Amino acid sequence: VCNKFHLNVSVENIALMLKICTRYLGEVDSTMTIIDISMLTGFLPDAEDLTRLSKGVDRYISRYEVDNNMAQKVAVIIYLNKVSHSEDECLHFKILKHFEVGFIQPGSVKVYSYYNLDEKCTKFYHPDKGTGLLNKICIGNVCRCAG
Secondary structure, eight states: OOOSEEEEEEEEOOOEEEEEEEEESSSSOEEEEEEEEEOOSSEEEBTTTHHHHTOSSSEEOOOOOEETTEESOSEEEEEEEEEOSSSOOOEEEEEEEOSOOSSOOOEEEEEEOSSOSSOOEEEEEOSSSSSOOOOEEEETTEEEEOO
16 A cells, blocks of 8 residues: 555654655656644644644645644644655644543544545554554454454
8 A cells, every 4th residue: 555655654752743754656746735634632733833834825724723722623634736756845743632531542644636536645643653553463364453
């Protein structure tokens, strides 16, 4: 899975800084890339870091509500006109957990563009696990839940 895009998400400590990096797998800068980020449990974007991401016409976020320096979008969308195929157009912003629940659930970051809406490059991110996949003990074809 995840052809047509190089996407790997990491998240590092500091509330903890979430960093996304992406690169197109073609020859031309692909037009109208959509970043589709869904938060963890109880984590909200910083309203002064996401505002820094939306400076200009290069990157466009929709209308979001602001409260207690937290953006009120659990799923957040980043529209940007081009994605580079030589370098890595990275971006980063902080996710502020206010209310704490047991058993944090993995977030997700999706990438797709206009001419490929049949693109399914998703990569989950967990603040404790590396790959972001929730735990399962899996022997070949058949699989089970670890817990």
